[PDB]
Amino acid sequence: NMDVIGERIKRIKEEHNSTWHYDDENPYKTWAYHGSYEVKATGSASSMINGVVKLLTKPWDVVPMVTQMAMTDTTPFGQQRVFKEKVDTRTPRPLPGTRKVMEITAEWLWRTLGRNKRPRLCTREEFTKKVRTNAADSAKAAVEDEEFWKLVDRERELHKLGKCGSCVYNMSRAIWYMWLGVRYLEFEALGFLNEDHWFSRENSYSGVEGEGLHKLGYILRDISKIPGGAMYADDTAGWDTRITEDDLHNEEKIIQQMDPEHRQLANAIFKLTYQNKVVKVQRPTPTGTVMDIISRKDQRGSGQVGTYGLNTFTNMEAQLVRQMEGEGVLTKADLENPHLLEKKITQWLETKGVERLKRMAISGDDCVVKPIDDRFANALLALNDMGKVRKDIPQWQPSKGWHDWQQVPFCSHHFHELIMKDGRKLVVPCRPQDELIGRARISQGAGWSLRETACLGKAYAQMWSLMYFHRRDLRLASNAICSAVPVHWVPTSRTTWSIHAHHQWMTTEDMLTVWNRVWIEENPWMEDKTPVTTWENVPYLGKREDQWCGSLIGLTSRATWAQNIPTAIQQVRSLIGNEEFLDYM
Numbered sequence: 001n002m003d004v005i006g007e008r009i010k011r012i013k014e015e016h017n018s019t020w021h022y023d024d025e026n027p028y029k030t031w032a033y034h035g036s037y038e039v040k041a042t043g044s045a046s047s048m049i050n051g052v053v054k055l056l057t058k059p060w061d062v063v064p065m066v067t068q069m070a071m072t073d074t075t076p077f078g079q080q081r082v083f084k085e086k087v088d089t090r091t092p093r094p095l096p097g098t099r100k101v102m103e104i105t106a107e108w109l110w111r112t113l114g115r116n117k118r119p120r121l122c123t124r125e126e127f128t129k130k131v132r133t134n135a136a137d138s139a140k141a142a143v144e145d146e147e148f149w150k151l152v153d154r155e156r157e158l159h160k161l162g163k164c165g166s167c168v169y170n171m172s173r174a175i176w177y178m179w180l181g182v183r184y185l186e187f188e189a190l191g192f193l194n195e196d197h198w199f200s201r202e203n204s205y206s207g208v209e210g211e212g213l214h215k216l217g218y219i220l221r222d223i224s225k226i227p228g229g230a231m232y233a234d235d236t237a238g239w240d241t242r243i244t245e246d247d248l249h250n251e252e253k254i255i256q257q258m259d260p261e262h263r264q265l266a267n268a269i270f271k272l273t274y275q276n277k278v279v280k281v282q283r284p285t286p287t288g289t290v291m292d293i294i295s296r297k298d299q300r301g302s303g304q305v306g307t308y309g310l311n312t313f314t315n316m317e318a319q320l321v322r323q324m325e326g327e328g329v330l331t332k333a334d335l336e337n338p339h340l341l342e343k344k345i346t347q348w349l350e351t352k353g354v355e356r357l358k359r360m361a362i363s364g365d366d367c368v369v370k371p372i373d374d375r376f377a378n379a380l381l382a383l384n385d386m387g388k389v390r391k392d393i394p395q396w397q398p399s400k401g402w403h404d405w406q407q408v409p410f411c412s413h414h415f416h417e418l419i420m421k422d423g424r425k426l427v428v429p430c431r432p433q434d435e436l437i438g439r440a441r442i443s444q445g446a447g448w449s450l451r452e453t454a455c456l457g458k459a460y461a462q463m464w465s466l467m468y469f470h471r472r473d474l475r476l477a478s479n480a481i482c483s484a485v486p487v488h489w490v491p492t493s494r495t496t497w498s499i500h501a502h503h504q505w506m507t508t509e510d511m512l513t514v515w516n517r518v519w520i521e522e523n524p525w526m527e528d529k530t531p532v533t534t535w536e537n538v539p540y541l542g543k544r545e546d547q548w549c550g551s552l553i554g555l556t557s558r559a560t561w562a563q564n565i566p567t568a569i570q571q572v573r574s575l576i577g578n579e580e581f582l583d584y585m
């Protein structure tokens, strides 16, 4: 294994030859440990609190989920506990028959996904444009430096020779240029899956890439119209740690569709940084803090360019395999058989494949499946054998499905169908309210002024007005935040890193105008384009549903907050200063 990773470890070792040592008390059991060096400890035991949101959500000061979210340990201690609890495991190799059906399905799926689209290399100027639009970090400074691109070119030449010198995953500007350079090179070779929307619903059938949270519920409602069994949405326990060497070799098959110069670079990413990887992780010691150098041949590196798309691919494949087992196409005997009949798998894929993909909504490790009947609930042999063991359920207990699409969990949400006062139906996204408030109360970074804090608060408020307006407490808190923050202050930072967020709330445009654009004008499931002219006609969940989903409506403390909210707004305004404010209450 040293022939692939040796050069990276040699460069790390030489850069820290003063403090480099082999810590024999290292806690790694399934990862190869190469050595350690001294570092300055990074992270925090607690997250910073957004005072603007906190002051305008007083009843949630006494809420346990709101307190828990404010914690999250990122210190070397936090890094180590997460590592031990999840990442330091080995997935048993799938059986020979399971490997065979996965290989057949992966070959058919890649050909289906590439039926209209051709892979291509992504560029420096594409990466540059993405970095600029995201910052509008030190990444914008690097991208502007010609020496950054010269470091990139030197690494690419090693990749072209089948070698890697500086692409290290992390759990001086030279080390930062090497990390961003590593990410650019991955973007160059595999970025096309995202940039050219290979996992869009039109291209992939099961996929939802580019859809946006406001479309997911409508897609689940459409799947519910397909004849079949219940809708299943099983969670995998730590999906990224369950990506096997066999999964990685099946994902690598996309390189067969590439032009020769592209194939060479993508083969370098797969073989040197996915199937072999060098990882840095911080660890507390009695003496201080060390950086450990570790390696392994499987699992998925969570913070990589190709992660979302490749997880979506492998999950689509795994769910098709589970549907084949449910239909009796794959038997227990087939999974143990290296010599299983390839023809019946091929025949099912060619005649039923696409129809079975349309029965699913797949976003990375998140899946919703509506099989042809409920035999799927007990079809667990291939799923468990592929390593995709379901979270917090005995291995052989049947999956429980839903017969109502509104009860289905997907991407941390569930979806409600609302009837507007004018008779039109809306399908809206929702999650436990404490989660929404708890997140909005967390600020991103230290040494952030009242201005930056208030602008992030406004970004959360405006996200609530656009996606979660149907929650009484969030509409009231949103109105309060937007009344407390100067009208012309532009929302900053980001409320989420979800691929499903399109950030339409990152504006100073009227939120009702934006609401009409998203929910009426652009909404393909809204035939009648009549605009809503007042928030009074923007619906809420039924009161009982709002309460079931965490609303404090009906509580005295909530009634007191609603009554006295102009006082808290004025208190925020007085600390912000003599600025232009608008009264949204």
Ligand SMILES: COc1cc(C)c(C(=O)NS(=O)(=O)c2cccc3cccnc23)cc1-c1ccc(C#CCO)s1
Pocket (backbone or CB within 6 Å): 212, 213, 214, 411, 412, 413, 435, 439, 463, 467, 495, 496, 497, 498, 500, 501, 502, 503, 504
């Ligand atoms: C599928 O959509 C989402 C899923 C999640 C997970 C988040 C999200 O960040 N949640 S979070 O902060 O509470 C959170 C943070 C970190 C890890 C988590 C793990 C599990 C659950 N939450 C986590 C946000 C959105 C969106 C919010 C608005 C959206 C829109 C639109 C239209 O353009 S899309």
Ligand SMILES: [Zn+2]
Pocket (backbone or CB within 6 Å): 155, 159, 163, 164, 165, 166, 167
């Ligand atoms: Zn490299």
Ligand SMILES: [Zn+2]
Pocket (backbone or CB within 6 Å): 414, 416, 430, 431, 545, 549
């Ligand atoms: Zn709900």
